[PDB]
Amino acid sequence: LPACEAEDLATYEQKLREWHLERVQLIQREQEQREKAKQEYQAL
RNA sequence: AACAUAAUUAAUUUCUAGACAUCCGUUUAUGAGAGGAGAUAAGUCGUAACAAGGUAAGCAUACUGGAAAGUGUGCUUGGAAUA
Ligand SMILES: [K+]
Ligand SMILES: [K+]
Ligand SMILES: [K+]
Ligand SMILES: [Mg+2]
Ligand SMILES: [Mg+2]
Ligand SMILES: [Mg+2]
Ligand SMILES: [Mg+2]
Ligand SMILES: [Mg+2]
């Protein structure tokens, strides 16, 4: 078990960084659609 | 009235809401009362037509009359025409 903890903890740090990047993408995509929504109302 | 969410399998939602009510008219039935035509069928009043029907007849039209009918004007023969 001691050896597995080191391996699992290393993967855990990688997952945290992967999750952080994916979360930022969702936040950015949300901002763009909301900005477009304003333009759509301006056209409407 | 027609947008908005969502999106590291992908989908959700919108994609509406009133007013289609009277009609203006148009047909038919009802018929106060007033007429017509026809038939019923013994009658009444005249004798208008058919004979040159006893005023030759008729047409259009006008007027007149119990009723057929009478009179005028033009027209027709589906009348006559030698004294
Ligand atoms: K006569
Ligand atoms: K007569
Ligand atoms: K005659
Ligand atoms: Mg006569
Ligand atoms: Mg006579
Ligand atoms: Mg006459
Ligand atoms: Mg007279
Ligand atoms: Mg006279």
Side-chain angles (χ1 to χ4, degrees):
Chain A
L1 196 74
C4 286
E5 289 163 23
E7 177 171 4
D8 290 15
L9 275 162
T11 308
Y12 176 58
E13 191 179 343
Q14 294 169 18
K15 275 282 166 183
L16 284 163
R17 179 57 178 179
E18 172 182 351
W19 296 344
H20 166 87
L21 296 162
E22 190 171 343
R23 182 182 55 83
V24 166
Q25 297 323 280
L26 293 166
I27 293 157
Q28 289 163 353
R29 182 176 68 185
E30 194 196 65
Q31 184 171 3
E32 295 164 35
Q33 79 181 347
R34 285 189 275 92
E35 183 178 2
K36 182 178 179 180
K38 294 179 179 179
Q39 294 177 336
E40 292 176 350
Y41 278 109
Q42 292 176 336
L44 293 157

